[PDB]
Amino acid sequence: MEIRYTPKELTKLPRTVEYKNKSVYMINQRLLPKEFKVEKFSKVEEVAEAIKNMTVRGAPAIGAAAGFGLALYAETSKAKTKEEFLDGFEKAYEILKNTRPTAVNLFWALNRIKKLVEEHSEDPLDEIKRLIVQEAYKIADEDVEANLRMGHYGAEVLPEGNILTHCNAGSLATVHLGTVGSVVRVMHKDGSLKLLWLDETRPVLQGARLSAWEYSYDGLNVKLIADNAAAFVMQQGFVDAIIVGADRIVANGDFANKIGTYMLAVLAREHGIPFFAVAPLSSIDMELKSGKDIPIEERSPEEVLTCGGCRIAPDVPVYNPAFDVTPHKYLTGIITDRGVVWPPFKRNLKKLFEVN
Amino acid sequence: MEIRYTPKELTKLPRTVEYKNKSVYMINQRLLPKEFKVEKFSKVEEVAEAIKNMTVRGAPAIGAAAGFGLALYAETSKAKTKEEFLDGFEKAYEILKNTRPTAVNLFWALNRIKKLVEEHSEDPLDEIKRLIVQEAYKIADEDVEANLRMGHYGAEVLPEGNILTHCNAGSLATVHLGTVGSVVRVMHKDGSLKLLWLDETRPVLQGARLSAWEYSYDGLNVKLIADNAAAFVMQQGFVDAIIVGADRIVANGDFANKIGTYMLAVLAREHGIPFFAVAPLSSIDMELKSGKDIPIEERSPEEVLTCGGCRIAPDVPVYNPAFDVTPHKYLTGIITDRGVVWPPFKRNLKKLFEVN
């Protein structure tokens, strides 16, 4: 696998989150798709609020934001001793930790820096600062390079033609390029993406609001449809392959993804349309044996009773599972940042983990 | 196989379209679910504007409205000569015909009354008026009694427990009670309807805006979901059967219904869930052999780009097929106003028509 493209050749978008001149810069994902704006944040409180705000979203972008919040702390701290600095650093760690206490990459990112600083607490204070900043760049850059690899691996295995996806697994859901987004960006550059179908993805509408915007921004050929219509476009012969992201892949290859993914897996199979998940190794949870061990999160009934700003239903009971679980047998393959995993997934995933 | 309930035992709702005391009364479907309002119309043009407007919707309800438009003409005409009446009657007929030149029941309703006014053109004039008014009540009543019959036929064959449906095929889609609406109202009265799952049915959201409203009005235990979640509620074992309406059933049983119906059909099958269409004999087009002979109708991109009027997407291309076509093999049976049709549908449908 040779990486043939740089990020800048694949997208015209800036990084979802960037650190430059003692400032954290974030695409404002609350204003999309009406307005495209890069917010500039100069205090750790502003960064924390922007995580709580969901000004930034997508697990790795949130991680990088938090990590760059500590970098910002390091370059900005008015501390006159190492003791003061470390005390401030702990305060800053805690402020950033308690934005979304559940979001997993947030915790990884902060703890990775925290742990590096404790390990180096006896180094000179300029060297601790240097290390923190360096670490925050490493977190961001690792996401981007995982995405670069995924894109090229995925682009080898998907057919040319018409691809269909679900939700938002683009540049906005990552530091840069996307998971799905990387694959379709490489395909687009290669001339092999004729059409990208985008499920709007109710209830939260990240397909319509986010995917439709970024893929359009980059000049991909795109068509936005109601979720109801994915089966129709498959039935009419309009889809050559389906690619989705994953919130969590477990040991046998079962995976959790935005609600509707399971629907697509079953329709793909009915039409013999190749069906792929794409995610980095860090999204594979080898602790859980199968899909039945993934706990189902339900979100507010307001996400269904409303649609954008508009209230479109009477006060009635709702069921709003955020994620469904797709059994592994529906997968043609799993595209990762270390190559494509083929059936049997159990065996090939555990291989992948031993050799990477 | 006895009718065990009257319309008024099954629903608290008035007729979607009613005629009394020289006024056409229609439920304002434009203002639901926020506001329940019955509009009063007193001129033919008021009634035509309401059909063009989609104040009224659903094929048989549009039918009845048209017919009552002629009744309203009949009882409102100053005309002195018999030939002055027939001039303003062909004028009324032409105004009503030019509202939706495409929705079929409107034409049957209007042509049916016109051929009854040609076949008695040499009666008195108090007599022709009485016949027009009377024929219009026939058209409306005939829908309601057909619904009553589907209702009881359907309740016989669906299991007790948890039912899932799609779009609006309730009271508001008809003169009264509904197709699907009638079946679930009869089950609710028998106490066999434990839970009714309602797909909101993007993009037009008639599940959320209309079905959730009317079924809740009648105290049915209801739960609203995003279309993406149907597959998932089937997977978790929450659905004992699925019943949908039909816009058009052809001679082999293939049928066209609101976009997403085919998605449900495929999922029902994967989970071994019984899957029924319900429609009157008049919805069956014995002149088309199969579903490829049903032309595919696109509607406005704004239906997808907006949600209840709220803009949710950037300006990107959309595909908005308004209906899909479900292959007959997905059907457990077809519930009609003259009994349930079983496989093999082609053979049994033409036996249904032979004995009527």
Curated annotation (Swiss-Prot), chains A, B:
It comes from the Archaea. The record marks 167 as: Transition state stabilizer. Gene3D superfamilies: translation initiation factor eif-2b, domain 1, Translation initiation factor eif-2b, domain 2. It holds the Pfam family IF-2B. GO terms for biological process: L-methionine salvage from methylthioadenosine. GO terms for molecular function: S-methyl-5-thioribose-1-phosphate isomerase activity. InterPro entries: IF-2B-related, IF-M1Pi, IF_2B-like_C, Initiation_fac_2B_a/b/d, M1Pi_N, NagB/RpiA_transferase-like. The active site is at residue 247. Keywords: Amino-acid biosynthesis, Isomerase, Methionine biosynthesis. It catalyses: 5-(methylsulfanyl)-alpha-D-ribose 1-phosphate = 5-(methylsulfanyl)-D-ribulose 1-phosphate. Substrate binds at residues 57-59, 100, 206, 257-258. HAMAP family: Salvage_MtnA (MF_01678). Belongs to the eIF-2B alpha/beta/delta subunits family. MtnA subfamily. Catalyzes the interconversion of methylthioribose-1-phosphate (MTR-1-P) into methylthioribulose-1-phosphate (MTRu-1-P). This is Putative methylthioribose-1-phosphate isomerase. It comes from Pyrococcus horikoshii (strain ATCC 700860 / DSM 12428 / JCM 9974 / NBRC 100139 / OT-3).
